[PDB]
Design a protein around this ligand. Structure first.
Ligand code: 3NG
Length: 348
């Protein structure tokens, strides 16, 4: 009657119902955890929802339980729904799968980019998106909570309907999103201050130096992630296209300058250093890739203008090695970069 498979996944497709209430109408994506479907909610006037279905596996169903509690508390601490976190309307246990019902939104920021041939969002869009991220996460931080898994895939457009513009200088078409309003999603790694902090958090590309070096992590972790994301919105490609610790650190040095010595002394990962200098093989493929591809942060600017200088200044502050030294989100919202917003953008 209700069927599964190997890793757990519920056997469902467009047509199938959950709880005699949620009628599946399409697919939205899949992942390591399980699936996300578009449904109609027949107990709420055929409301359009995005239903997340965690797999029927002990530790997944388990971790989902804490995800819900995080969402309960976000919901509970923002009743006006003004702080731009994905809104959970409902959660439930279906024969082993924890399902979480969310408001239905458009494409995530990675998927939009991919479909735009990895051509960057205009700086005004980067500016408005940056501003929402800071606001959302500042709110999360304010509340003893750290996301830990921020990345473009986890940032969703409310509506991703785009305009098509011809780019004169590039001789090709570009997709320009009509509404740059966003929501922060995927709280299945979000962590309270008083809860246990796993040693390693974040997707590698967005993982900060204090985590690699194993110096402990707090809220500033999310700030490092945002720097990475803003660069990625600005250029269209990943800042740290890395698969390995050593390489990652070398990339951080090539791009941001040398690791501060107090962090080298504090870490118990001394296998990376040698007389306070990073040890790596420059003639290996990794070494050559980094040599070829990783230049100082400023060399990535596309324009000299003030608003571009300002973005790159905020970005460097977001990407400070020392987390104690790293800009906070409250300081970020005060930066002369957001003086470029429109009152509609600024007022939320
Ligand atoms: O986890 C959440 O908090 C979460 C919450 C809501 C959505 C979501 C993830 N992922 C979506 N799409 C998506 C895109 C790519 C891969 C995957 Cl697995 C899912 C999506 C789409 C439309 N409306 C809401 C959502």
């Amino acid at each position: 009657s209700v069927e599964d498979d190997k890793e757990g996944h519920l056997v469902c497709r467009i047509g199938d119902w959950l709880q005699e209430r949620y009628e599946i109408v399409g697919n939205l994506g899949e992942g390591t955890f399980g699936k996300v479907v578009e449904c109609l909610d027949h107990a709420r006037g055929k409301s359009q929802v995005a239903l997340k279905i965690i797999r029927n596996v002990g530790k997944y169903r388990e971790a989902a339980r804490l995800e819900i509690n995080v969402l309960k508390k976000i919901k509970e601490k923002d009743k006006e729904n003004k702080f731009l976190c994905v809104l959970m309307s409902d959660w439930f246990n279906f024969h082993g799968h924890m399902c979480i019902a969310f408001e239905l939104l458009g494409k995530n920021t990675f998927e939009f980019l991919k479909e735009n041939n990895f051509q960057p969002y205009p700086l005004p869009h980067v500016r408005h998106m940056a501003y929402q991220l800071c606001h959302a996460l500042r709110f999360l931080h304010e509340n003893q909570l750290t996301h830990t898994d921020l990345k473009p895939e986890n940032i969703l457009f409310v509506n991703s309907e785009f305009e098509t513009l011809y780019n004169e200088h590039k001789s090709c078409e570009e997709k320009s999103v009509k509404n740059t309003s966003i929501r922060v999603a995927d709280f299945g790694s979000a962590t309270f201050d008083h809860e246990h902090h796993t040693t390693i958090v974040a997707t590698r590309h967005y993982r900060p130096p204090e985590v690699i070096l194993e110096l402990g992590w707090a809220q500033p972790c999310d700030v490092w992630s945002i720097g990475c994301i803003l660069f990625e919105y600005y250029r269209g490609f990943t800042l740290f296209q890395t698969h390995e610790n050593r390489e990652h650190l070398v990339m951080m040095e090539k791009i941001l300058g040398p690791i501060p010595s107090h962090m080298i002394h504090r870490t118990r990962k001394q296998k990376y250093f040698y007389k306070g200098g990073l040890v790596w093989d420059e003639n290996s493929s990794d070494g050559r890739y980094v040599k070829e591809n990783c230049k100082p942060l400023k060399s990535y600017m596309l324009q000299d203008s003030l608003e571009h200088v300002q973005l790159f200044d905020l970005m460097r502050r977001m990407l400070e090695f020392d987390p104690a030294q790293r800009i906070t989100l409250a300081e970020a919202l005060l930066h002369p970069f957001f003086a470029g917003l429109t009152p509609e953008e600024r007022s939320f």
